[PDB]
Design an enzyme around this catalytic site. Structure first.
Site, PDB file in Angstrom:
ATOM      1  N   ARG B 138     -55.441  67.690  38.269  1.00  0.00           N
ATOM      2  CA  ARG B 138     -55.197  66.383  39.228  1.00  0.00           C
ATOM      3  C   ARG B 138     -53.652  66.967  39.551  1.00  0.00           C
ATOM      4  NH1 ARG B 138     -56.984  60.902  36.341  1.00  0.00           N
ATOM      5  NH2 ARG B 138     -59.333  61.428  36.407  1.00  0.00           N
ATOM      6  N   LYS B 254     -62.174  45.769  33.628  1.00  0.00           N
ATOM      7  CA  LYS B 254     -61.803  46.606  32.764  1.00  0.00           C
ATOM      8  C   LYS B 254     -61.588  46.160  31.483  1.00  0.00           C
ATOM      9  CE  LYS B 254     -57.420  48.186  34.239  1.00  0.00           C
ATOM     10  NZ  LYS B 254     -56.371  49.050  34.195  1.00  0.00           N
ATOM     11  N   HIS B 304     -67.503  53.659  33.104  1.00  0.00           N
ATOM     12  CA  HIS B 304     -66.758  54.614  32.898  1.00  0.00           C
ATOM     13  C   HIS B 304     -66.127  54.344  31.256  1.00  0.00           C
ATOM     14  CE1 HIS B 304     -66.082  55.921  37.074  1.00  0.00           C
ATOM     15  NE2 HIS B 304     -66.346  54.779  37.100  1.00  0.00           N
TER      16      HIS B 304
HETATM   17 ZN    ZN Z   1     -65.851  58.217  35.206  1.00  0.00          ZN
END
Ligand code: ZN
Ligand code: ZN
Lengths: 465, 465
Positions: B138, B254, B304
């Protein structure tokens, strides 16, 4: 059937030209050409491979390392040429500064050598041997990409060795011995006078200083290390040695490992790893200076070596030579448990036996697929299983197996390329699991002698059958 | 002392601002800033980590995979936004066509799901869980880079879960249970009511359809899965739960795993992995369609999740919280064998004992460093060893140990943060090796319960002492 077919059928890879559900576009139009996408069957193979090769190398005296995937191009300028190799590199910018996706691990492995010398100086032993399951990326044109053989990103069992003159012949020889142990024990490929060739590629002496860089002395010490080592290989195994004048790289001579295979019935070379000297790198990274000053050694060699080479490529050619038949430790499906149902009440004991054996093998860390079959379905079910999934071991559980308390267990024999039937007695499910695990441990034995531990990376692959 | 100091002293990494021998430039001017270069001590840690986490996940029902490092940007266009995230991506050209170094594994893991559905349809079981020790890159600006905490290339213990409505609460809960097992057993970090916090980040209900994408139903089913799971966590461990309205990502709510630590004596959060729902990906890759058509499921979630998060970051903060003290399985030096020489004739038996124990431990697959010391040198030698190399176990072999046939063995106790002395009787070298290996197996025991096998990746690190 090519490795592209086997890799897809064993679910080692996603086929580039398979269509994505609902998008009805090819997987390759998301991934790009020549970027192998390893799938569910391929994942455990990749982790098992890294682990076995890493541990094998650590036991043979290599330090195992992992080096970054990207680098400033300063790293590759020093190594360098750069004007040339730049062209095979994927380059990108951070923040005005040029970076590359690593095409080779060498400069990183040399920096790690350099860091240890700075910290510990001559306490660092020589030869210095560093191993990496390394991930490299290189430009290939679309027309050059082929299956797993020629790709844009791949893995090497890469190592670098810095070895004084006194030990260089032994190091060369030992790398040959490493290659043989890996072929024979991990892959079950015989390495003998009838199956193997060692090819040396040397300077043209008239061209030293020009198309072959470095000094006469370097080239002579290196070519002569390869000749003695090869002479020991031939003496020990009767393996024949081929020498080609003028074929070396510009930066040093080499030896290539070559398996001889037969079709069909055509004799063909299967090129594997290499042992490659380098007169360039010790100049560019000032290794000759560093070794002379810190170790008081004037005669030293720098070696690049792999046993397999590209792992994807090796795996591609392996899948063809062995028609999709993986060694037990590397098989996507290790035990296929096949319940041969009858329609009668014995089906309950069959179902409970199969199911318990499957669970028990999973708990030992094995890769298991259960198939529900039948007396009339069996023959076509087995044929599908053999032509597609090719499990390392088939365990057939029918009425007879339940009543006689003997499993029908069929290990695939890689030499004869046939299933071989074993009769495995059991008292109950647990005892059956123990006995099947014993058969597996025998199949794992050669991999244990390489790495200490055979990898158990469990999976339920029933959905594949 | 920061993790930058510990990582360098333990030889886990090369220090960016260390000078390269002879070049007298900094390692960072070859590698680039924010590209951690793992060194000889760090290599075995990286292989051990991949292997333990991979096997842990395979035993918990995840398929382990490895996905490519590069991809066509078509892959990230579909996922996508692209106009935004493009900016954090390293982009490059092949051959007119735009490619990226992978910043996330998600789209690849979804393609692997899609491929298995195309091949096997509803035989593929749900929930579908896929794990990868994944390598991501990144863009970070130079001013943002810090040690191992914020870097340009790093590793995640990444997984993706596609789970029907009926099982989603259990999946969320199980991921918490996975995180706890890894903290406690691999890292020896207690997870209890006094050390741990679970934080939920939810929608603002007034903003659904706008700053929070997706339907009310999606958000409600997801937020309510997290509340029930968190309520089970709190019921079971008394671990407290914090809920923040309006803090979710635009694409789903999340849960974050947060260890509470104390200085010095300041209470501080140490953020670890996350469980993250996604309402975007099932739309962009048509997963809602695919699951509805092939499985007849209307309520399904895409998750995720990581337990540690960034492994480099986790490792950085770990090195600080534990002052350079690694759990046995992950220690660069596992056994330091320290020969306390006297000047007299007993030095021969001391030297032969130390040397044989060292060899024998290496043959069992351990990481060993031998230090030649002396009665007068001992105190300063030990102090150097403790302030730098921090071996998991010190084995002291002096005249007394030889004459009394009892080794002085000092395991470092991670809870008390002190060495703890054991008296290990032996009859000869071999028996000593067996007994030291038994102590090691006890230290490896928690890692065996996670992965079946504790990793033995041997190395002779004597040069470090
Ligand atoms: Zn992911
Ligand atoms: Zn190289």
């Amino acid at each position: 059937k090519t490795h592209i077919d086997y890799a897809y059928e064993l679910d080692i890879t996603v086929k580039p030209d398979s269509r994505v559900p609902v998008f009805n576009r090819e997987f390759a139009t998301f991934t790009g050409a020549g970027v192998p996408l390893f799938s569910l069957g391929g994942g455990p193979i990749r982790y098992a491979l890294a682990e076995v090769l890493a541990k094998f190398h650590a036991r043979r005296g290599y330090y195992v390392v992992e080096t970054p995937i990207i680098a400033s191009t300063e790293l590759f300028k020093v190594s360098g040429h750069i004007e040339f190799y730049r062209n095979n590199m994927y380059l990108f910018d951070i923040e005005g500064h040029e970076f590359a996706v690593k095409p080779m691990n060498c400069p990183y492995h040399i920096l790690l050598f350099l860091n240890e010398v700075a910290k510990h100086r001559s306490k660092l032993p020589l030869p210095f041997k560093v191993f990496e399951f390394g991930r490299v990326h290189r430009y290939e044109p679309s027309g050059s990409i082929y299956g797993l053989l020629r790709v844009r990103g791949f893995t090497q069992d890469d190592a670098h060795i810095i070895v004084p003159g006194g030990r260089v012949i032994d190091v060369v020889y030992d790398v040959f011995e490493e290659m043989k142990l890996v072929l024979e024990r991990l892959f079950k490929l015989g390495v003998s006078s009838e199956t193997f060739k060692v090819r040396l590629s040397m300077s043209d002496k008239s061209l030293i200083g020009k198309e072959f860089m470095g000094s006469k002395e370097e080239w002579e010490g290196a070519e002569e290390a390869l000749r003695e080592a090869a002479s020991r290989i031939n003496e020990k195994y009767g393996i024949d040695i081929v020498e080609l004048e003028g074929e070396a790289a510009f930066y040093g001579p080499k030896l290539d490992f070559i398996m001889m295979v037969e079709e069909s019935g055509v004799s063909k070379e299967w090129q594997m790893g290499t042992i490659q000297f380098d007169f360039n790198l010790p100049r560019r990274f000032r290794l000759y200076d560093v070794v002379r000053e810190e170790f008081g050694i004037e005669e030293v060699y720098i070696i690049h070596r792999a046993l397999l080479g590209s792992i994807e490529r090796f795996l591609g050619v392996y899948l063809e030579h062995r028609r999709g038949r993986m060694p037990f430790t590397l098989a996507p499906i290790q035990f296929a448990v096949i319940a041969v149902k009858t329609g009668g009440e014995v089906d309950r004991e069959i179902e409970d036996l199969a199911s318990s054996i499957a669970k028990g093998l999973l708990d030992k860390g094995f890769r298991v697929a259960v198939k529900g079959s039948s007396k009339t379905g069996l023959s076509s079910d087995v044929r599908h299983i053999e032509s597609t999934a090719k499990p390392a071991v088939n365990v057939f559980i029918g009425a007879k197996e339940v009543r006689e308390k003997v499993l029908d267990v069929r290990v695939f024999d890689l030499e004869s390329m046939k299933r071989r039937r074993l009769a495995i007695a059991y008292g109950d499910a647990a005892d059956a699991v123990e006995n099947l695990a014993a058969v597996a441990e025998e199949l794992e034995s050669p991999v244990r002698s390489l790495s200490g531990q055979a990898p158990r990376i469990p999976a339920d692959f029933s959905f594949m059958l």
